């Protein structure tokens, strides 16, 4: 709604690939690559986010009621991620962009 959760996009923090998906998203050709997936640590999820000349991601603490990041509490990773789509600003970054290859597109 105002934030994301439904109209947003990176609320997929349940069963996908691990470092692989983020490395893929962080190393993709275009900027914007966003993706949340499981990490090897318990209560430790992560968020892949590729920004123009800037890239950084780490572990998020998930609880069966309210997930929390390394600074604030959030209703499921999708909440803070939805906030990012709503307030991204990074030119082609808005939690709703694929990773187009310079060579292909």
């Amino acid at each position: 709604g105002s934030p994301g959760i439904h109209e947003s996009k990176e609320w997929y923090h349940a069963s996908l690939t691990r470092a692989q998906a983020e490395h893929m998203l962080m190393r993709v050709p275009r900027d914007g690559a966003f993706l949340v997936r499981k990490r090897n640590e318990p209560n430790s999820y992560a968020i892949s986010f590729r920004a123009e000349g800037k890239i950084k991601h780490c572990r998020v603490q998930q609880e069966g009621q309210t997930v929390m990041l390394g600074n604030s509490e959030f209703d499921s990773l999708v909440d803070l991620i939805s906030y990012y789509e709503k307030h991204p600003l990074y030119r082609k970054m808005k939690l709703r962009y694929p990773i187009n290859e310079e060579n292909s597109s």
């Binding site: 992560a46 968020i47 986010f49 991601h57 572990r59 990041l69 600074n71 991620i81 906030y83 990012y84």
Partner: peptide, 13 residues
């Protein structure tokens, strides 16, 4: 490396 961080994305920006 491939499986070990701590503070991910907390603020808009």
């Amino acid at each position: 490396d491939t499986e070990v961080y701590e503070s991910p994305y907390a603020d808009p920006e």
